[PDB]
Amino acid sequence: IMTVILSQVSFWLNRESVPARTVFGVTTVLTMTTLSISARNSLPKVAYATAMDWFIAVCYAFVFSALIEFATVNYFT
Amino acid sequence: PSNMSLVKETVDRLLKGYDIRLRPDFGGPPVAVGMNIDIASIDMVSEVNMDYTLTMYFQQAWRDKRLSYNVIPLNLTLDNRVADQLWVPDTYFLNDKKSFVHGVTVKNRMIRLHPDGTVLYGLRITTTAACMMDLRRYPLDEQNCTLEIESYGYTTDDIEFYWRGDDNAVTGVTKIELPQFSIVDYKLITKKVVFSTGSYPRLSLSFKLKRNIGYFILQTYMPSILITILSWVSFWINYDASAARVALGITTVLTMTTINTHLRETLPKIPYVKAIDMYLMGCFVFVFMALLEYALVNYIFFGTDVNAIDRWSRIFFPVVFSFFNIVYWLYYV
């Protein structure tokens, strides 16, 4: 949740500062990989999402969508 | 106590002068030893160790004229401790790495002398049978794991196996729910393996396991494809913002390496490339190619038209990656 909120704050920063937005977005995406890996280690490899991987995946899509929106605004400049 | 005393006399008569060293009808036709199995559970399919843990009720009925009784009309079910005092098939699981009969409360065995003579020997065996796992297309793979059942000493002339009830001999496989394997089908076979010594009797129970792609599609492929998509975004960033673009590519490549290392867990080291290995390599080399594309763009910058080269590079990458992805999936799916 905290990482997702950090993704939103990337919107708040600015649009003219391309490098800052880029760095923020890429690192935000990086964190979720470790977070997802850690959760799954305890559980057995059940095919169906256990509703924890569901939340993690939705948050992953949210931060990835933040990156997508960041790229979209970057195009216009 | 007349009934129970009479039953005691009958059992004493049966075990009187009973030579465990001799198979039924010695110096005679082979004894037909029917088998029926009830798979209690199949769990811990260890791809790394190439074996699966099987828990089952292993019944094996056979005829025996010595134990025939007629005074008692009902089916005696003697204590499980009498098995040691009776002959049994010298059955052994050929592809068993380690197995044991469950201990508590007492040794889980069954004996049931029917009036004709039929004996319903049964055991609750947990065995870690091993099946050579062909993980070339893993995770999009099937496995034909089996439990070869064979008589160690006796030859086909002395003992013969057969599934009792035929396709109904094995039960309960449908109820089994392995975490990541769907038991698509099970097949029962009867063979007479021809060894150097002679033709031994054989039975084979093979479960054609199929991998559940839901967990692998959840964790393996999805993050990788997402990371790969990120790489294309660097093409949108334009070339004047060199630092941001190269930062993006750098993050992508290191992310791919982290993915590979963390996914390596619970995987053996078979030499051939696994399907997961192939796809990870494809995405990783594609990300590296994206970085190299940025390098080419910058080198061309040092040497207007650079933007046009960027324009073509835009469309090519999603299209070529999509073609590669479709080739991969259709080849494997």
Ligand SMILES: *[C@@H]1O[C@H](CO)[C@@H](O[C@@H]2O[C@H](CO)[C@@H](O[C@@H]3O[C@H](CO[C@H]4O[C@H](CO)[C@@H](O)[C@H](O)[C@@H]4O)[C@@H](O)[C@H](O[C@H]4O[C@H](CO)[C@@H](O)[C@H](O)[C@@H]4O)[C@@H]3O)[C@H](O)[C@H]2NC(C)=O)[C@H](O)[C@H]1NC(C)=O
């Ligand atoms: C000690 O234990 C034995 C073993 O269970 C008991 O005797 C057998 O009990 C089974 C019940 O599970 C009986 O099974 C039924 O047999 C009927 C006739 O089978 C004859 O033919 C076969 C060859 O096909 C022989 O092997 C067999 O010995 C018999 O000679 C079948 O017609 C039955 O099928 C029908 O079941 C129901 C009810 O009839 C129907 O609704 C179905 O549609 C189906 O048509 C069934 O399979 C078996 O017959 C018994 N006899 C044996 C094995 O010889 C003893 O009773 C038990 N001792 C006790 C309780 O004291």
Ligand SMILES: *[C@@H]1O[C@H](CO)[C@@H](O[C@@H]2O[C@H](CO)[C@@H](O[C@@H]3O[C@H](CO[C@H]4O[C@H](CO)[C@@H](O)[C@H](O)[C@@H]4O)[C@@H](O)[C@H](O[C@H]4O[C@H](CO)[C@@H](O)[C@H](O)[C@@H]4O)[C@@H]3O)[C@H](O)[C@H]2NC(C)=O)[C@H](O)[C@H]1NC(C)=O
């Ligand atoms: C592989 O698996 C086989 C499976 O059978 C094992 O073989 C059995 O092993 C057990 C334990 O070693 C044997 O049990 C032993 O039976 C002996 C003989 O019992 C008969 O004779 C006595 C009188 O001497 C009668 O009272 C009895 O009713 C029988 O008629 C016993 O003397 C043994 O007693 C010893 O162990 C007990 C444990 O409680 C001690 O309290 C005693 O003091 C004494 O030390 C024992 O009960 C069994 O008989 C074997 N099977 C057969 C068919 O004989 C293999 O051991 C196993 N091997 C490996 C390597 O895993």
Ligand SMILES: *[C@@H]1O[C@H](CO)[C@@H](O[C@@H]2O[C@H](CO)[C@@H](O[C@@H]3O[C@H](CO[C@H]4O[C@H](CO)[C@@H](O)[C@H](O)[C@@H]4O)[C@@H](O)[C@H](O[C@H]4O[C@H](CO)[C@@H](O)[C@H](O)[C@@H]4O)[C@@H]3O)[C@H](O)[C@H]2NC(C)=O)[C@H](O)[C@H]1NC(C)=O
């Ligand atoms: C997983 O891996 C196991 C490996 O053990 C596979 O088991 C083998 O399966 C194949 C085919 O399913 C077996 O090969 C043959 O199957 C025949 C099936 O009988 C039907 O089909 C034949 C024609 O094919 C008809 O004539 C017959 O009437 C039936 O309709 C058996 O009949 C074969 O045995 C005969 O031929 C051999 C060779 O000629 C003779 O030696 C025999 O005496 C007999 O006359 C033969 O068994 C093979 O036997 C199985 N066991 C092995 C290879 O050890 C599984 O199929 C595979 N898949 C799954 C899902 O488990």
